Amino acid sequence: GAQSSEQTTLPSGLQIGTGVRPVATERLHSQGNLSQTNNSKDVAIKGQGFFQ
């Protein structure tokens, strides 16, 4: 309703709302640590980029 400002009054309306649907599943793309495997054919990446 209308707040007259004559009295301190509560702004009472009514809206209920619903639900908490999941909106996204973000992928936190940070540089992981490195682990030495001593294998010659194995390789890791510093910085961004993906093997195709």
Binding site: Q7, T8, T9, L10, S12
Partner: protein, 65 residues
């Protein structure tokens, strides 16, 4: 309205008004505000013996909530 019918009907009306006030109280417990914005003051009814002229008894009136 027949006399004893008047007595008992007044009783019915008074008890009904008492119950309505009690229902309003029980429903408006935990009510932050009124319309203009003021506490909801709990309400009670006042019972008085009816038939001011004659016999000093007979019926109940619930004037002045």
């Amino acid at each position: 309205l027949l006399n004893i019918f008047d007595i008992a009907g007044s009783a019915l009306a008074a008890q009904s008004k008492r119950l309505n006030v009690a229902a309003s109280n029980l429903a408006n417990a935990d009510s932050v505000t009124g319309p203009d914005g003021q506490p909801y003051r709990a309400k009670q009814v006042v019972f008085q013996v009816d038939a001011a002229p004659g016999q000093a008894t007979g019926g109940v009136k619930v004037a002045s909530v």
